[PDB]
Amino acid sequence: RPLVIILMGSSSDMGHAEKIASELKTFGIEYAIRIGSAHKTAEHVVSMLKEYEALDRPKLYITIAGRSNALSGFVDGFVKGATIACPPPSDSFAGADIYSSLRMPSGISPALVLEPKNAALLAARIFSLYDKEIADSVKSYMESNAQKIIEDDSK
Amino acid sequence: RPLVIILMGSSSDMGHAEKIASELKTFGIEYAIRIGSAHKTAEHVVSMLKEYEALDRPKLYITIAGRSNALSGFVDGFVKGATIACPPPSDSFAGADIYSSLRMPSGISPALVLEPKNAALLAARIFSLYDKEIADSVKSYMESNAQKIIEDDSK
Amino acid sequence: RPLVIILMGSSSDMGHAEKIASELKTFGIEYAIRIGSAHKTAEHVVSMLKEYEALDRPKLYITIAGRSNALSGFVDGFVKGATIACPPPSDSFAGADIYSSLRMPSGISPALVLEPKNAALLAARIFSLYDKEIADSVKSYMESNAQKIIEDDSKL
Amino acid sequence: MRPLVIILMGSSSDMGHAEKIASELKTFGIEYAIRIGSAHKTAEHVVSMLKEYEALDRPKLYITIAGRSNALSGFVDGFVKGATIACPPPSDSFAGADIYSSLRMPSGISPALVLEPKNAALLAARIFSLYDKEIADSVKSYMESNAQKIIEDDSK
Amino acid sequence: RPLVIILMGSSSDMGHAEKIASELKTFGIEYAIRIGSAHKTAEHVVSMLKEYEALDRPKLYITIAGRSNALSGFVDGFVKGATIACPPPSDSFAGADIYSSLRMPSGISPALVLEPKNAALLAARIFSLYDKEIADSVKSYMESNAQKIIEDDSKL
Amino acid sequence: MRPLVIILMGSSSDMGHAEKIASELKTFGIEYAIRIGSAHKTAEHVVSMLKEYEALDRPKLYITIAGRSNALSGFVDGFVKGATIACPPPSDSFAGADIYSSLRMPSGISPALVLEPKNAALLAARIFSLYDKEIADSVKSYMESNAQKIIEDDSK
Amino acid sequence: RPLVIILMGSSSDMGHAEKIASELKTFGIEYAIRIGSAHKTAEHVVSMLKEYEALDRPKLYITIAGRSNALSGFVDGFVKGATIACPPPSDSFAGADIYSSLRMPSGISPALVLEPKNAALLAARIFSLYDKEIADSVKSYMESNAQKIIEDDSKL
Amino acid sequence: RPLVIILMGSSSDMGHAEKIASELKTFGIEYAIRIGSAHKTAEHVVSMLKEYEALDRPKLYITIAGRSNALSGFVDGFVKGATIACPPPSDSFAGADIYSSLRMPSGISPALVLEPKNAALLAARIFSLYDKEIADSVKSYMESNAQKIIEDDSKL
Numbered sequence A, B: 001r002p003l004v005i006i007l008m009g010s011s012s013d014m015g016h017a018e019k020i021a022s023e024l025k026t027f028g029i030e031y032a033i034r035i036g037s038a039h040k041t042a043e044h045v046v047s048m049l050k051e052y053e054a055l056d057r058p059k060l061y062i063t064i065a066g067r068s069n070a071l072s073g074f075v076d077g078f079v080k081g082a083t084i085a086c087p088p089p090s091d092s093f094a095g096a097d098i099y100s101s102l103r104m105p106s107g108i109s110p111a112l113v114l115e116p117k118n119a120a121l122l123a124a125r126i127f128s129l130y131d132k133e134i135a136d137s138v139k140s141y142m143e144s145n146a147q148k149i150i151e152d153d154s155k
Numbered sequence C, E, G, H: 001r002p003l004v005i006i007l008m009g010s011s012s013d014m015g016h017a018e019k020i021a022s023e024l025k026t027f028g029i030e031y032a033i034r035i036g037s038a039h040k041t042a043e044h045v046v047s048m049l050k051e052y053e054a055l056d057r058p059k060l061y062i063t064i065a066g067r068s069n070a071l072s073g074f075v076d077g078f079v080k081g082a083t084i085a086c087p088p089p090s091d092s093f094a095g096a097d098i099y100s101s102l103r104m105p106s107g108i109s110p111a112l113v114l115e116p117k118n119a120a121l122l123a124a125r126i127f128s129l130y131d132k133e134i135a136d137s138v139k140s141y142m143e144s145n146a147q148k149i150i151e152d153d154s155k156l
Numbered sequence D, F: 001m002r003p004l005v006i007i008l009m010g011s012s013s014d015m016g017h018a019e020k021i022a023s024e025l026k027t028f029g030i031e032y033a034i035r036i037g038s039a040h041k042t043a044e045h046v047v048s049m050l051k052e053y054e055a056l057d058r059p060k061l062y063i064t065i066a067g068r069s070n071a072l073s074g075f076v077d078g079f080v081k082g083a084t085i086a087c088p089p090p091s092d093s094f095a096g097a098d099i100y101s102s103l104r105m106p107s108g109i110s111p112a113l114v115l116e117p118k119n120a121a122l123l124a125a126r127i128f129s130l131y132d133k134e135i136a137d138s139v140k141s142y143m144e145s146n147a148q149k150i151i152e153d154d155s156k
């Protein structure tokens, strides 16, 4: 039932998108990967979002755009359910592209998460408030992350 | 049915917490406001989170801590459902406290949102994937934000 | 004659827009002031741009958005002719909102200018390559600025 | 009255950045010239060169290239009548803070700042396109193609 | 005798921890190296600290956490005696992870030291106020560093 | 053999910051002295003062206070045998970047950096507390009370 | 017969220039105060600098320009002897205007000093290498600064 | 008989110091190279500076210390005539070590220059106010830099 739409601004973001998709798969969550720019292909992004919004199933969008991230806010303002911003990494200007993801106007509320695997985790825990299968799979994952540390310690 | 636990590190964060609480109220979402520090009162935060986790109702935590935000990551790692980090504003070191909210390890995934009203919005849209009442109230709110702009334009 | 569309993301940008509009008026350049957000009212911005794009007169767009400026690149990718990004000033995060105006993808080329009077000056000077009336007006304005400096020096 | 872009750089060391801009102007069919002159070390040489270019009866732009503390963009911009574009070479020294020397102009100095060399060439083309129809056709072709690659990437 | 507990948030911090541990060994100071995250294994850290806190010997904790350092303030608020924060080096966001170690609330007082050899030196020097054996060892180490500089100068 | 804290500041202008640190040490029952000396302007005066304090047979710490480029913390730290604490006065010049002059020590120089004056006093108390039981009781009282205010705020 | 030429970019810099001139006057050093912009009035600056350069006497230029400082490099590359950059203070972009004064090309060597009174002191101390009178006046002023600190101390 | 004393904080600075010395040698200026740290060897620096100060001849000190630069202010506050700070380059914290060289107290006026060859040029140009031979050598070198740029241009 759940769907995550992973929407990136450029094919050059694919490496980052696929890290998120891989991790969604570990949690049993269906995803779609799509490409569309809020600067260059604005009407194509709008028509694509109308198709997804029309589907009667619980959904999240994870929005990926490097440089000045117009995409996350654009998507977030169009759709009605929650969204997650997960920009690809950059060291340009000491990582200052990050501000274009953080500094939203009033009424625009994408969830910002830096790491791709953490973005996928957040999606899974959003669904888990009402989805017992996903909830069970997040529980197993997080406990295993905690076990690794305790096991590393005892060694 | 939904519950948002608003957990701040210090009573001096209350002004910021109350902005979030006010806005949750506009969406018909029950909240609890609580105080506890991840540096100073770690066992008290743990016992408080066990009580909330024990409740069989869909829940989110919104975690508020100024300066170096240990709280959001601490809470996020303990609980199983999603959390939101919403630190109070600061201009110390050009706002560099923000990094302590962004830079999470692997497996820790709080949603970072700067504005208090946007944090509340995000909570509401998380619930709205499965809650028709809240979904209807987010729809009305966001459409009214969009109408304001179009109305400002026509003037 | 030339037209400048001053498009801002919020009514709260109006004081900044008015400074740009006032300066354009001193060069005798017609303007229009409009409001629309790239986040909250994308289709309204799309619809509005299609209207301005259909006018047969030389035009520039001056795009104003505080915080994370999605508006300038959005408009820039939509319209045919040049645009100018002139964000309102902010000292939050030591002014780091500016990077959201600077960091464009390939094929998006808004001119970034900080001061609202300088954004109006650049717009004038874009038209001046072909518009002699605006060129003379720019010339008098720039010569005037230069003369004030020289007079300030000689008065010491 | 054919368009001209003068690409003026502060040092021979900037040549590779200048060539990326020249190359892209060539795809738009816009004539350019590449010149060298320092606002710090060869001020009178720059003034003499600008006076020569300024005398030409043709629509012109200057794209100004200087690394480190960019004195050149403001210097040229304050001297010439028509619009200019600042396109500094990339640097990660001090986390890119050389950029502030291109951004922070006094009143009356209005160079258009664009980071990417291809985007500086595109802004140049789109400035002429307000009046030059052939350049406008070439810009629509270029920007349409950028957009089609994206749609095409998605559908693939 | 003195004990230093070197507590790091992840196995990936081990190379940094080992540099601190090696340096302590040159001052003849006993250490223990442990792993626990303030985010992922809070109760394990609580349980571990209660064990070390029950030892009747002078102790310091040296706390190592990359990224947003929750670990140092968490341990510092829990234990009675002093602690030292020594985060692993990072150049992400121009090193801005450092602020997560600096910006403590009221009543949380870890000593921040950047270099792992300097964190070990501070720990030694904390003990040295009361431990003559560590004091002589510190004295020889510091005099030695000073002599190398003077010898480098005289050799020129 | 009673604890002593020497609070050494670079200028009389730092006095208000020094007093906040002295006040808090007083609540812990720790004797202090407040002195003035510049590592830039009065180097020999500082060396002479440090030699006097260093000769005392009692557990001692130096808390060093210098605004702007902090030469003083490293200067004192390299001179004395036992631990030191850097606690610079607050500044928002250059977005607080004076802090890097307290953080970036060479090898062999290990002052403890703490931002808040009350926290620098607490770190001092907790350094002595490893060996001094009365100070440890006073620290538990203090930190327990901080924690109780919080629990008490929540339950109210 | 030393001369220090204080050249600023705008009359709005006059308050900063007056602090420098005042301090120069305390050392018995003659100054001239002048206004000219490297962006808006380049030829005016060149002709001004020609007049001073033609004076057969030991001279320094102190160059003041806010925002992107094109002036100090421009002056420095033109004149023969040493120059000093002392820009006015700014909090814009976390004080990032400073980079425009720091980041010079090869062959351009203005001395950067932040504080106006310290810019005047460096000027004195430059001349003092060969001017015995200024060496006496610098010596008494610096000694007087040291003595103030020692007296402030002795009162505690 | 000018003397430039190049004083560095650590032998690890030697590569940077050698670039300065090399360039001084091209202007016919005698230099000495010395090592001493303001943190670890303060008395050694003081006694060294006493020896050079006692020389009846025109001198400058060029002070090199990486990380938190305590050295330039320390040297500058001690000696009578002008000094120059030229720290080694660093990318640590986005180059924020630079602030430790910029942010001086009242009465401390080291000239800050980034590039080693420019530090040597400022040294020359300081002496050139009264030394006719160095003025000739500076003049030919600066003219030669200008001519290179004009020749690079003329080839395009």
Ligand SMILES: Nc1cncn1[C@@H]1O[C@H](COP(=O)(O)O)[C@@H](O)[C@H]1O
Residues within 6 Å of the ligand: A008, A009, A010, A011, A012, A013, A037, A038, A039, A040, A064, A065, A066, A067, A068, A069, A070, A088, C104, C105, C106, C107
């Ligand atoms: N900010 C933005 C707007 N449209 C695309 N981008 C982003 O800018 C970078 C460069 O895009 P392109 O490959 O189209 O030049 C990519 O990360 C892409 O997500």
Ligand SMILES: Nc1cncn1[C@@H]1O[C@H](COP(=O)(O)O)[C@@H](O)[C@H]1O
Residues within 6 Å of the ligand: B008, B009, B010, B011, B012, B013, B037, B038, B039, B040, B064, B065, B066, B067, B068, B069, B070, B088, E104, E105, E106, E107
């Ligand atoms: N970082 C942190 C850890 N424990 C509390 N804080 C935060 O630090 C600031 C100062 O807290 P206090 O009032 O306890 O000094 C408050 O915003 C609080 O959320």
Ligand SMILES: Nc1cncn1[C@@H]1O[C@H](COP(=O)(O)O)[C@@H](O)[C@H]1O
Residues within 6 Å of the ligand: A104, A105, A106, A107, C008, C009, C010, C011, C012, C013, C037, C038, C039, C040, C064, C065, C066, C067, C068, C069, C070, C071, C088
């Ligand atoms: N970045 C952005 C996207 N949509 C509007 N903004 C800008 O965000 C600020 C706050 O907008 P509002 O008043 O809509 O909250 C305004 O400067 C506005 O231009």
Ligand SMILES: Nc1cncn1[C@@H]1O[C@H](COP(=O)(O)O)[C@@H](O)[C@H]1O
Residues within 6 Å of the ligand: D009, D010, D011, D012, D013, D014, D038, D039, D040, D041, D065, D066, D067, D068, D069, D070, D071, D089, G073, G103, G104, G105, G106, G107
């Ligand atoms: N800022 C400046 C002033 N004069 C030239 N530049 C720039 O400084 C860098 C180094 O110049 P040079 O090669 O002359 O040392 C080059 O990018 C050049 O454009």
Ligand SMILES: Nc1cncn1[C@@H]1O[C@H](COP(=O)(O)O)[C@@H](O)[C@H]1O
Residues within 6 Å of the ligand: B104, B105, B106, B107, E008, E009, E010, E011, E012, E013, E037, E038, E039, E040, E064, E065, E066, E067, E068, E069, E070, E071, E088
């Ligand atoms: N900040 C934090 C909280 N818990 C662990 N970390 C740190 O985050 C980094 C990545 O941790 P992991 O290897 O657990 O992903 C490590 O430096 C670790 O100390």
Ligand SMILES: Nc1cncn1[C@@H]1O[C@H](COP(=O)(O)O)[C@@H](O)[C@H]1O
Residues within 6 Å of the ligand: F009, F010, F011, F012, F013, F014, F038, F039, F040, F041, F065, F066, F067, F068, F069, F070, F071, F089, H073, H103, H104, H105, H106, H107
């Ligand atoms: N960095 C430094 C060197 N000597 C003194 N300071 C500090 O610089 C500031 C100004 O010093 P003054 O009052 O002497 O001008 C004060 O905080 C002082 O501690």
Ligand SMILES: Nc1cncn1[C@@H]1O[C@H](COP(=O)(O)O)[C@@H](O)[C@H]1O
Residues within 6 Å of the ligand: D105, D106, D107, D108, G008, G009, G010, G011, G012, G013, G037, G038, G039, G040, G064, G065, G066, G067, G068, G069, G070, G071, G088
């Ligand atoms: N950078 C520059 C070039 N020409 C003048 N300035 C500086 O820009 C600021 C504003 O100048 P104006 O008053 O001309 O707008 C002033 O500090 C002035 O020295």
Ligand SMILES: Nc1cncn1[C@@H]1O[C@H](COP(=O)(O)O)[C@@H](O)[C@H]1O
Residues within 6 Å of the ligand: F105, F106, F107, F108, H008, H009, H010, H011, H012, H013, H037, H038, H039, H040, H064, H065, H066, H067, H068, H069, H070, H071, H088
């Ligand atoms: N700041 C300072 C004080 N004493 C030496 N340094 C500098 O710190 C760096 C490392 O010094 P060391 O080699 O002594 O660790 C070198 O650039 C040196 O000049």
